[PDB]
Write a protein that binds this ligand. Structure first.
Ligand SMILES: [Mg+2]
Ligand SMILES: [Mg+2]
Ligand SMILES: [Mg+2]
Ligand SMILES: [Mg+2]
Ligand SMILES: [Mg+2]
Ligand SMILES: [Mg+2]
Ligand SMILES: [Mg+2]
Ligand SMILES: [Mg+2]
Ligand SMILES: [Mg+2]
Ligand SMILES: [Mg+2]
Ligand SMILES: [Mg+2]
Ligand SMILES: [Mg+2]
Lengths: 107, 31, 153, 63, 50
RNA sequence: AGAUCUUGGUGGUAGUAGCAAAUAUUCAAACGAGAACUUUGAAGGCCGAAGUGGAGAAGGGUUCCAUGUGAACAGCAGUUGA
């Protein structure tokens, strides 16, 4: 299919390790976008404002280590655009990250 | 009056911010 | 207007021109040398790749301090860059030339850039301020560009 | 399209700073139609312009 | 300043009135030889005499 | 052909030095041909009342306000602007 939605967890700690203090949360946004692009094969990635707030929740340098996100590949078929598909990345609040798999989520 | 469809979308418009911000009171159009 | 190198058969050819264009003359010369002799489709996709930093233009004459890149090995050379403004200006000129070809009624799928030339335009003066109460020039280096495309397959 | 004038007028009418002026991000065209303090007052009455509350600075810890 | 004399205010008034572009119909006159107002003054580039 | 000659123009240097003082930006949307910079909303920060706040004197003189433009100027850009 091509309108699929899945739930992943991202090791922000792994992808941000080594980055300076004033760059950790912007680089976390960049790595989330890059992760979404690699997973769904869509250069158009929109990040939910709630997700951005979750990443910036603890300031610019103390980004959360792991984050549970939902990638939703959706039709861009609304106007003349180079990409007919796009990925909306939303925030999934969880209480623990133990034993969380990448899971297909239905409608 | 309020039904389930009206309530579920009303929750969106009254929230104009995250936790700890005042709720929207009204949005009235009048010509 | 008088181009240099008028085409041998000015019925299978189309022309494009631009004057006092606000791009750097050295970068534009290198990019024009890169795209010279190409097919029009190849040149268009190559300039788009240069904008996307997937193919470079080799800097052969104006290469003082230009860094090295892996994409320069496609060319027989070592120093290359990705002039975005030069690529976009030549893309606009290529679209204009293709529209001229459509107007002259010759199919735009067999066009080859046989002539492309970049001249220096009159410089434009700006002012910069130096250490001890001194004024120094801040000139721009615009360029004229011309190109003649020709049908051959 | 560019609501600098509307934010300034709303601040002047609401007697607050431009920090506390909230313009509806959805009714941008309707707010942009407002070019007078009367129209700003009408928008405030209609709820398209809202004065945000003062940021909480609690003295409970000090007490 | 805000406090000014009448002579100073009148001087500034004349400077304002003569700091404007030329009319368009001037360039259509016979033997014009005028392209633009070459006496244009900007308040930040060049300062007034007073 | 010279005078560290006068005036004007143009090179190499060189697409080089450089655009590194004062912690910091991010997400979405709108307008728009075009958005790192414009506007709006959300978030994270800074000035921290001896202020990066609110008002005056001197000095400036229309820079004030609205609308529009996108040539030049704002040492990147701009749909913004003293
Ligand atoms: Mg060198
Ligand atoms: Mg300097
Ligand atoms: Mg000085
Ligand atoms: Mg001065
Ligand atoms: Mg001589
Ligand atoms: Mg001699
Ligand atoms: Mg450099
Ligand atoms: Mg530097
Ligand atoms: Mg502080
Ligand atoms: Mg003060
Ligand atoms: Mg103004
Ligand atoms: Mg500039």
């Amino acid at each position: 299919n091509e309108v699929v939605t899945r739930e992943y967890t991202i090791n922000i700690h792994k992808r941000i390790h080594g980055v300076g203090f004033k760059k950790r949360a912007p680089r976390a946004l960049k790595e989330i976008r890059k992760f979404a692009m690699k997973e769904m094969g869509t250069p158009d990635v929109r990040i939910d404002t709630r997700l951005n707030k979750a990443v910036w929740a603890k300031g610019i340098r103390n980004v959360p280590y792991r984050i549970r996100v939902r990638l939703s590949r959706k039709r861009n078929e609304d106007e003349d655009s180079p990409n007919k598909l796009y990925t909306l990345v939303t925030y999934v609040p969880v209480t623990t990250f133990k034993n969380l798999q990448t899971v297909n989520v239905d409608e | 009056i309020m039904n389930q469809e009206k309530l579920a979308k009303l929750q969106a418009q009254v929230r104009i911010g995250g936790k700890g911000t005042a709720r929207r009171k009204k949005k009235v159009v009048h010509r | 207007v008088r181009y240099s190198l008028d085409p041998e058969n000015p019925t299978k050819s189309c022309k494009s021109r631009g004057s006092n264009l606000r791009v750097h003359f050295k970068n534009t010369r290198e990019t024009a040398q890169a795209i010279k002799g190409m097919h029009i489709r190849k040149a268009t996709k190559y300039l788009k790749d240069v904008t996307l930093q997937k193919q470079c233009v080799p800097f052969r004459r104006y290469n003082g301090g230009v860094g090295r890149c892996a994409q320069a090995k496609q060319w027989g050379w070592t120093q290359g860059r990705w002039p975005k403004k030069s690529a976009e200006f030549l893309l606009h000129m290529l679209k204009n030339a293709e529209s001229n070809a459509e107007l002259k009624g010759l199919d735009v799928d067999s066009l080859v850039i046989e002539h492309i030339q970049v001249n220096k335009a009159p410089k434009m003066r700006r002012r910069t301020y130096r250490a001890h109460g001194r004024i120094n020039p801040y000139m721009s280096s615009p360029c004229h560009i011309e190109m003649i495309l020709t049908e051959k397959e | 399209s560019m609501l600098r004038l509307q934010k300034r007028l709303a601040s002047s009418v609401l007697r607050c700073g431009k920090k506390k002026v909230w313009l509806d991000p959805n009714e941008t065209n309707e707010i942009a139609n407002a070019n007078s303090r009367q129209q700003i007052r009408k928008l405030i009455k209609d709820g398209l312009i809202i004065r945000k509350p003062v940021t909480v600075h609690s003295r409970a810890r000090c007490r | 300043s805000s406090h000014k004399t009448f002579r100073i205010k009148r001087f500034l008034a004349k400077k304002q009135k003569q700091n404007r572009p030329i009319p368009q119909w001037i360039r259509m006159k016979t033997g014009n030889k005028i392209r633009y107002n070459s006496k244009r003054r900007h308040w930040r580039r060049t300062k007034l005499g007073l």
